[PDB]
């Protein structure tokens, strides 16, 4: 896979963000991140993307938009994956794979196990 540049336009919620991507505005849904702490997840994502000096989007090898026209990607802020950071913090669960987008699934499951062991936030 590869990372592509994007500019934050607006934080929306724990697993949704609006970015300028290839000179066009687009709502992105964070791949493989489920949010049942909803306000907590929102604040966490908001801070991570607003404080970033560099935001990148990384599509996976499966379908790239959902039925609502949202881009389905891994989002990075200064190189750190937001999807994984939310799962590792116990602020989201790992979702079911959607349409072949599973590159980072195993890695996210490891983060989720560790958050669960630590009884963090949703795993309280």
From Swiss-Prot:
Biased composition annotated in UniProt, kind: Basic and acidic residues: 104-120
Active site: 29, 70
Segments of this protein annotated with the region Disordered: 104-124
Subcellular location: Secreted
Domain of life: Bacteria
Residues holding Ca(2+): 15, 34-35
Full protein name: Nuclease A
């Amino acid at each position: 896979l590869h990372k592509e540049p994007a500019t934050l336009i607006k934080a929306i919620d724990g697993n949704t963000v609006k970015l300028m991507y290839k000179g066009q505005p687009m709502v992105f849904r964070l791949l493989l991140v489920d949010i049942p702490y909803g306000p907590e997840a929102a604040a966490f994502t908001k801070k991570m993307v607003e404080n970033a000096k560099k935001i990148e989007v990384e599509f996976d090898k499966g379908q790239r938009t959902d039925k609502y026209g949202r881009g389905l990607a891994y989002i990075y802020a200064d190189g750190k994956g937001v999807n994984e950071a939310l799962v590792r913090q116990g602020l989201a669960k790992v979702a079911y794979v959607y349409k072949g987008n599973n590159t980072h699934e195993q890695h996210l499951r490891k983060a989720e196990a560790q958050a669960k062991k630590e009884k963090l936030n949703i795993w309280s």
